[PDB]
Design a protein around this ligand. Structure first.
Ligand code: BCL
Ligand code: BCL
Ligand code: BCL
Ligand code: BCL
Ligand code: BCL
Ligand code: BCL
Ligand SMILES: CC[C@H]1c2cc3[nH]c4c(c3C)C(=O)[C@H](C(=O)OC)c4c3nc(cc4[nH]c(cc(n2)[C@@H]1C)c(C(C)=O)c4C)[C@@H](C)[C@@H]3CCC(=O)OC/C=C(\C)CCC[C@H](C)CCC[C@H](C)CCCC(C)C
Ligand SMILES: CCCCCC/C=C\CCCCCCCCCC(=O)O[C@H](COC(=O)CCCCCCCCCCCCCCC)COP(=O)(O)OC[C@@H](O)CO
Ligand SMILES: COC(C)(C)C/C=C/C(C)=C/C=C/C(C)=C/C=C/C(C)=C/C=C\C=C(C)\C=C\C=C(C)\C=C\C=C(C)\C=C\CC(C)(C)OC
Ligand SMILES: CCCCCCCCCCCCCCCCCC
Ligand SMILES: CCCCCCCCCCCCCCCCCC
Ligand SMILES: CCCCCCCCCCCCCCCCCC
Ligand SMILES: CCCCCCCCCCCCCCCCCC
Ligand SMILES: [Fe+3]
Ligand SMILES: [Mg+2]
Lengths: 53, 49, 273, 245, 287, 53, 53, 53, 46, 49, 49, 53, 53, 53
């Protein structure tokens, strides 16, 4: 999919694509934030020193 | 035919799909080269020493 | 259109997201948006279980495989992937897959024009799993309260949690759940046998109808539940069994922290005597 | 030792494996019984019957029906009625689109089975589902509200008519259908109706005013066949997908 | 033949009439003798006080003979003889009731499927009380006739034979009980969902398939890839319920007779999980 | 499947095929990232020394 | 099946056979990769010394 | 309900009311007698000294 | 009042009587469950 | 109206119900005063000492 | 309307319900004043000291 | 049933009789082989001394 | 979605979208508040010193 | 069944009989191989000394 491939929406439903993409992006963002929270250096709410080893 | 597409439609769709897949594979190859430069991922006879 | 009568039923509709992109079948299975999410979560969870199996240093068999939850010291936080994080991620994926299975069943029911009794009943099993792995751990303040994901190790979790109260048989909710589970098997045996006896009367006998079905139980126990009442009764019995299991596990630790036999001092030393 | 055959094998393991064999045989038998309806399978693209082994399809069993007749399962009968729905390209799994009115045609959730064209009977041979206006031995329990006279509201909040009678199962003493005179008479399946005794209304959210005007009707006003029952129930069930939308 | 409004809401309202017959009367006589024995031993155990009986009824029981009596055919009364009599009379009443159910199925022209489903439960009950004590030669291995006491017997039976969780037939019986609940919830919900299509009239759907049976089959085919018929799901449920008590009897037969420690049996067969040694230096102080 | 085999879309439905392919690729990427996260040398968020022995 | 046995596809559906083959091949590849990862000499991500005995 | 409210029975069925009242009174009397029997001082059959402390 | 033109007096009275009896039993049990108010056990007030 | 009672019947029933409720509440108030005289049930700042 | 109750019968019912609710709230306010006079329930900085 | 009573098959169905008889014979043979294996003197695979006491 | 894309609601139902968005926002707000409460520096009800190490 | 009793196939369906016989033979072969594996002297994969005593 590119800036010029506008005819993708003649095949793929815009509604399903938008609702599936939004769900996937929210799930991915939550997963990555939790993975960052699960490690010593990147847990910003915990505030460990950056040099963790 | 079976899918209801015309060979003209299938040809254009395959052009777009082929370009997208080739770009995805090129990005994956670049990411793999970057990951190898970060840390090589095939051990020697002695391991990660 | 696989069964001899399936073609006329395979139409568009039933989607919970309002779209035709995922409306299709792969073999006998119906694929939805929630079918795709079910497969996503399922393959993630199964692959992570296999990863935890191959990374186990003790070389366990399929029975001895165990992905254990984090330590109770990690609280409701995040554990290392090899120290409970894998269990946490598999729990999240399992909850997502079960909810997606229920929603896909809702979609199939909407397509077939039937009631949503099946997704609703499966929601009780999903609620039991959630109460075991998410709700009770948060009530107790640690994800380490969930059971390990292993065929045989979750039995050890059950055993030790039961012996944490010195006699789990004396839990009143446990008693109610066991009563309802045994009654569900009794009722299922009675119902299956009655329908099989009506449909297979034997040699020289015609297929019996509702009169014979009601007469058999009025002649045996003294009451007939009917043909619609038996299925309501069975659904109610199974749902009550799972509900009382949830209650008994939510009162063990969050509520009762001592031996379960001494809870009956409310009856032994009831203010009457 | 007592229950040992060797240093590894023992009696419990062998009994467990014997039960494994028995359980797998029982599951095989059960799966054979599962294939008494709808098999052999057919392809989704041309309707070609798929070949199933005689070890997976059981031999036909004969049901001697209570009122006469013999039903066999499997029966070599296949539902080949023309479905009034189409799809673009015969791709396996592609869902169908109704050409006209899916409710009248019986497409999808409105589809019905060609059952017996005779009314259902009781043990003594008298019609099982009859309107209450014909039988004097059957009445309505005074503890429950009487549906008769209640207004009938569709899913569009429109009063489409009033309940004129109730059709009762004489074999189970249960109300099966509601005879509704449209403000010309239709049967509403009771599971598809919600009663409100304070406002004296019956809500059928699966129908619109347009769908009520096309509900199939029995040939007789005191007699309904199994096929007519099946068609009416399928119509109201398909209304959940095709009416208010 | 009275009516019941409350029972007429969940199902039918008619309670009766009940046909007892010869085997029914015999079963009632035997069972009443058994119940009288059990209840009078319970009431005598609180020194006949009904206040204490009300207080302690869950804790009261009729207790089996001790291990010092072995399989003595009739031990002294107050040392397990009352239990042996109550077990004999209960077994006779249960067997006569099974014959009654078989006969009721036969006289109605119906199949004897409920009778042979009851036979599985009777087999489990007999293994629990008579057959296994005979092989082990001790009445003491049988459950007491009491509310909390047979739970104590359950727990002590699991403890005595090394964590009955590791009994493969206990695992199978638990799988079959969970499957009984699963299948019966599935079937109740499925029939209730197609009740708008006449699905509760299942036997009429068996000899004449309607859209209710077709949609019930297709829901499960589209959900899990396979389905049953309107009659086959009842065979599924019947067999699942029968296997509960069949595997229960099989796993109780094997406890103490061929397997004495189930956890060690699982250790031999690579079933018991091994956990990291958190307590490194703990050994048996009596070794 | 090569650059010149454009007629595969006359047999495979583009919509279903791409939905399945997107799901498979995303899940495979998640699995391979989790595998790197589960090993000492390749967990970039934990940041252990490269020489893990 | 050989190079010259082109008439398999008059007996086997090409599309369903391709889906089944793709599923089998990915499952087998995952099985073998996990088997390699579960052994100390062939776990390339753990990087144990090659001579493991 | 007092002496002058004779019209209770125009709203309450006398037979059902009498049966329910008899059952309630018997159960209440049994409850209070068991309450007396369950306490040392008012158990007339056990006959403890009144001064029970 | 017109309360009884909307609520059935019989059912309201039978439900209220049941509620009041249950409440009285519960409060009496609450009093018997404390040493200061157990008038049958007869413990000292203080 | 909703219940098959005439407004006069409802007024008479309300009169009797109000009388009965007032009597019940008066007896309960006297019972609570007697119970307070027996042993007060609201503790002071020091407790039951 | 959607209830079927007349707009005047609803007015009478709301009048009676309003009086009942106002009496209930007055009794609750009196009970809360009495409970505060028994033991105040908002601690100071020092707490229950 | 003897060598001359050929009219048994006018009473018992041959096909089902042989199927049931084969099942019974196989089950009995397995049971007796396992009974021999369950005893020290007759377990030919364990090979204990024939003198067993 | 922007200030000028008013025809989104010709594609998405305004009411189901509103209720789904409300549910999502409430759940997200609850999750973020609980994450703040689960960490020492941001649990405003426990009142730990801001400098937590 | 002997070399000359060719009319058994007028009684037993050749297809189902072959399938059932194959299933029985495979199950029996697996059972005998596993019983050989379950004894020290005949487990060819463990390679115990033949004199197991
Ligand atoms: C973001 C604005 C445009 C867009 C602009 C472009 C441009 C320009 C290009 C692509 C290209 C690609 N796009 Mg794009 N693309 C869009 C939305 C999508 C969506 C989607 C459903 O949202 C998908 C699956 C894709 C998929 C893809 C890939 C298959 C393909 C190259 C793979 C890759 O680089 O990373 C792997 C893919 C992923 C990890 C998932 C996709 C993630 C993002 C959206 C990929 C876009 C990267 C693109 C270069 C960023 C340009 C946007 C800038 C902010 C201006 N695009 C929208 C419509 N896209 C390239 C191509 O086909 O040439 C060979 C290319 O040059
Ligand atoms: C990427 C752009 C083109 C494409 C371009 C080519 C070219 C050119 C060739 C192939 C060949 C093959 N392709 Mg290809 N291929 C595409 C998309 C696919 C898809 C898919 C559903 O997306 C699949 C399953 C395949 C599968 C395959 C293999 C079955 C086949 C040989 C196996 C192999 O060499 O590597 C093993 C397979 C894997 C590790 C997994 C397969 C997935 C990837 C996409 C394989 C393609 C990699 C290809 C060799 C690299 C060329 C693209 C460059 C980036 C420019 N292709 C798209 C349409 N493909 C080769 C062939 O026919 O053999 C003689 C070949 O020469
Ligand atoms: C690879 C390109 C060709 C192909 C070319 C050949 C040639 C040439 C030969 C075979 C032969 C065989 N092929 Mg072939 N075969 C193909 C695809 C298949 C597929 C499939 C569903 O994809 C299957 C199951 C098979 C199976 C088989 C075996 C049943 C058979 C002999 C078994 C064997 O040698 O090893 C056991 C098989 C397996 C463990 C699984 C099979 C997997 C692969 C695909 C088998 C390839 C074997 C063959 C030597 C490939 C090398 C070809 C070189 C490029 C020249 N082929 C494709 C179409 N195949 C041989 C034969 O028929 O004997 C007379 C033979 O000489
Ligand atoms: C002799 C028994 C007479 C009777 C004669 C009277 C008289 C006189 C009075 C009442 C009053 C009342 N009666 Mg009366 N009452 C009767 C039967 C009942 C029954 C019943 C279903 O049997 C019930 C529920 C009641 C209930 C009540 C109360 C709601 C009400 C005041 C509460 C109370 O005094 O103590 C609480 C109630 C209970 C704990 C349960 C009821 C117990 C008994 C049955 C009530 C009798 C109490 C009354 C003082 C007895 C005095 C009779 C003497 C001859 C004077 N009565 C019969 C018909 N009842 C009083 C009243 O209306 O006040 C304005 C009042 O002055
Ligand atoms: C073996 C080949 C013949 C056969 C030839 C004979 C002859 C000859 C005699 C019998 C006799 C008997 N047969 Mg015969 N019998 C056959 C098959 C059967 C089958 C069967 C379902 O296959 C059954 C249940 C029987 C049953 C019986 C017994 C009821 C009866 C003697 C009891 C006995 O010996 O105790 C043990 C039995 C069992 C534990 C069960 C049966 C096992 C076998 C099959 C019984 C055969 C025993 C027989 C003596 C062997 C003779 C064969 C020699 C080569 C001559 N037969 C076939 C058709 N059978 C005897 C008789 O009728 O007495 C007057 C007798 O003289
Ligand atoms: C808030 C007032 C307007 C609105 C005004 C604008 C303006 C102006 C812009 C956008 C832009 C975007 N909007 Mg908007 N947008 C609205 C409602 C939405 C909703 C929704 C369902 O409620 C969603 C999912 C979005 C999503 C988006 C993104 C897809 C897109 C760029 C992503 C981004 O910048 O951050 C990532 C987004 C998220 C993580 C979630 C989205 C959160 C909010 C609602 C997005 C608006 C943020 C915007 C940048 C701030 C400007 C609004 C000010 C309050 C005036 N908008 C409402 C109707 N929106 C930008 C764009 O089109 O790119 C070129 C842009 O310039
Ligand atoms: C509430 C009443 C009973 C109930 C009801 C019920 N269950 C149901 C249904 C109903 C009505 C369905 O419609 C649905 C179904 O489709 O059944 C065929 C389902 C179902 N009941 C199932 C099983 C099941 N039900 C159980 C119990 C019960 N189900 C209750 C007793 C149990 C028990 C007691 O153990 C089990 C195992 C499934 C067959 C099915 C739901 C299938 C499903 O969710 O599929 C999507 C998920 C996957 C394909 C796999 C996901 C895997 C995860 C990603 C990783 C693994 C996580 C897991 C926690 C590991 C566990 C390890 C050890 C603990 C073993
Ligand atoms: C569907 C419902 C969902 C909601 C469920 C939760 C609802 C809860 C409402 C609870 C209302 C409580 C009302 C006041 C309770 C008073 C106490 C009481 O009811 O009496 C209790 C026993 O009651 C008893 O079982 C009562 C039963 C006795 C007879 C049993 C037969 C005992 O009393 P306590 O003082 O605890 O003595 C114990 C110790 O302190 C002293 O040894
Ligand atoms: C005072 O009491 C009155 C009069 C009011 C009556 C009331 C009675 C009451 C209240 C009774 C209550 C009973 C209860 C609560 C019983 C509960 C029992 C439970 C829970 C039992 C659980 C398990 C028991 C089992 C499995 C027992 C099995 C026993 C068997 C199968 C024994 C068989 C024995 C045989 C066949 C003996 C044969 C005789 C021989 C052959 C030995 O003679 C030589
Ligand atoms: C959804 C609510 C989540 C609440 C999480 C509370 C627990 C997180 C903080 C305590 C556990 C981590 C402590 C620090 C460990 C090292 C750094 C990751
Ligand atoms: C029902 C889900 C959880 C509801 C909120 C629970 C709040 C209490 C959590 C306490 C955690 C810290 C104490 C235990 C360690
Ligand atoms: C190798 C083990 C094979 C086990 C096969 C079990 C088959 C069980 C079949 C049970 C049902 C039989 C038919 C009953 C019909 C109704 C009769 C009244
Ligand atoms: C022509 C297609 C016929 C159907 C093929 C697919 C069948 C899929 C069956 C899925 C359910 C299998 C459940 C097995 C559970 C075993 C215990 C884990
Ligand atoms: Fe049923
Ligand atoms: Mg031995």
């Amino acid at each position: 999919m590119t800036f010029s491939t506008h005819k993708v929406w003649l095949m793929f439903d815009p509604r399903s694509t938008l609702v599936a993409l939004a769900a996937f992006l929210v799930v991915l963002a939550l997963l990555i934030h939790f993975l960052c929270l699960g490690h010593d250096r990147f847990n910003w709410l915990e505030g460990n020193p950056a040099a963790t080893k | 035919s079976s899918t209801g597409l015309t060979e003209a439609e299938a040809k254009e769709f395959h052009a777009v799909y082929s370009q997208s897949a080739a770009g995805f594979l090129a990005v994956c190859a670049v990411a793999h080269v970057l990951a190898w430069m970060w840390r090589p991922f095939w051990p020697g006879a002695e391991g990660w020493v | 259109a696989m069964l001899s009568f399936e073609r006329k039923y395979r139409v568009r509709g039933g989607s919970l997201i309002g779209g035709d992109l995922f409306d299709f079948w792969v073999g006998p299975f119906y694929v939805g948006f929630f079918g795709v999410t079910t497969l996503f979560f399922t393959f993630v969870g199964v692959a992570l279980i296999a990863y935890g199996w191959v990374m186990d240093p003790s070389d366990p068999t399929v029975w001895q495989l165990s992905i254990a939850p984090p330590d109770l010291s990690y609280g409701l936080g995040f554990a290392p992937l090899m120290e409970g994080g894998l269990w946490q991620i598999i729990t999240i994926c399992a909850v997502g897959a079960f909810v997606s299975w229920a929603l896909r069943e809702v979609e199939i029911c909407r397509k077939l024009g039937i009631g949503f009794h099946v997704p609703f009943a499966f929601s009780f099993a999903i609620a039991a799993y959630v109460a075991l792995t998410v709700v009770r751990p948060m009530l107790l303040g640690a994800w380490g309260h969930g059971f390990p994901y292993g065929i045989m190790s979750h039995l050890d979790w059950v055993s030790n949690v039961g012996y944490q109260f010195l006699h789990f048989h004396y839990n009143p909710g446990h008693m109610l759940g066991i009563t309802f589970f045994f009654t569900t098997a009794l009722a299922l045996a009675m119902h299956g046998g009655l329908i099989l006896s009506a449909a297979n009367p034997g040699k020289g006998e015609k297929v019996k109808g509702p009169e014979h079905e009601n007469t058999f139980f009025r002649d045996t126990v003294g009451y007939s539940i009917g043909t619609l009442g038996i299925h309501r009764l069975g659904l109610i019995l199974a749902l009550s069994a799972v509900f009382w299991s949830i209650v008994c596990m939510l009162i063990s630790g969050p509520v009762w922290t001592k031996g379960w036999p001494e809870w009956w001092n409310w009856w032994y030393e009831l203010p009457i005597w | 030792m007592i229950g040992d055959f060797s240093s590894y094998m023992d009696v419990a393991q062998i009994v467990l494996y014997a039960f494994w064999i028995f359980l797998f045989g029982v599951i095989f038998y059960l799966r054979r019984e599962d294939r008494r309806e709808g098999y052999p399978l057919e392809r989704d693209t041309d309707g070609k019957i798929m070949s199933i082994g005689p070890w997976n399809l059981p031999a036909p069993k004969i049901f001697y029906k209570p009122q006469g007749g013999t039903y066999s399962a499997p029966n070599a009968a296949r539902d080949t009625r023309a479905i009034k729905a189409t799809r673009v390209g015969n791709f396996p799994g592609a869902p169908l689109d109704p050409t006209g009115d899916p409710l009248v045609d019986g497409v999808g959730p409105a589809a019905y089975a060609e059952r017996a064209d005779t009314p259902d009977k009781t043990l003594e041979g008298r019609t099982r589902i009859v309107p209450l206006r014909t039988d004097a031995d059957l009445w309505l329990a005074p503890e429950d509200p009487d549906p008769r006279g209640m207004a009938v509201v569709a899913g569009c909040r429109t009063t489409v008519g009033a309940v004129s009678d109730v059709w009762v199962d004489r074999a189970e003493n249960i109300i099966r259908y509601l005879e509704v005179s449209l403000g010309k008479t239709v049967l509403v399946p009771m599971p598809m109706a919600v009663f409100n005794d304070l406002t004296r209304t019956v809500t059928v959210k699966s129908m619109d005013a347009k769908s009520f005007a096309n509900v199939p009707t029995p040939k007789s006003a005191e007699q309904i066949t199994l096929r007519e029952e099946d068609r009416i129930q399928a119509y109201y069930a398909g209304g959940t997908l095709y009416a208010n939308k | 033949s009275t009516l019941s409004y409350w029972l007429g809401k969940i199902g039918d309202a008619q309670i009766g009439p009940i046909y007892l017959g010869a085997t029914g009367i015999a079963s009632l006589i035997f069972g009443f003798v058994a119940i009288e024995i059990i209840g009078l031993n319970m009431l005598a155990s609180v020194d006949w006080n009904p206040v204490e009986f009300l207080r302690q009824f869950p804790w009261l029981a009729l207790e089996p003979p001790g291990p010092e009596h072995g399989l003595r055919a009739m031990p002294p009364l107050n040392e397990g003889g009352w239990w042996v009599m109550a077990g004999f009379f209960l077994t006779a009443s249960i067997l006569l009731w099974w014959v009654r159910t078989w006969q009721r199925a036969k006289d109605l022209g119906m199949g004897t499927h409920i009778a042979w489903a009851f036979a599985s439960a009777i087999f489990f009950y007999l293994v629990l009380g008579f057959i296994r004590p005979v092989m082990l030669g001790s009445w003491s291995e049988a459950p007491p006739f009491g509310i909390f006491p047979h739970l104590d017997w359950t727990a002590a039976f699991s403890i005595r034979y090394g964590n009955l969780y590791y009994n493969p037939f206990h695992m199978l019986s638990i799988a079959f009980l969970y499957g009984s609940a699963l299948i019966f919830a599935m079937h109740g919900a499925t029939i209730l969902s197609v009740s708008r299509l006449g699905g509760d009239r299942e036997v009429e759907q068996i000899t004449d398939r309607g859209t209710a049976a077709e949609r019930a089959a297709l829901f499960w085919r589209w959900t899990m890839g396979f389905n049953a018929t309107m009659e086959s799901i009842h065979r599924w449920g019947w067999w699942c319920a029968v296997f509960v008590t069949l595997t229960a009897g099989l796993g109780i037969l094997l406890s103490g007779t061929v397997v004495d420690n189930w956890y060690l049996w699982a250790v031999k067969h690579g079933v018991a999980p091994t956990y990291p040694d958190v307590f490194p230096g703990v050994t048996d102080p009596a070794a």
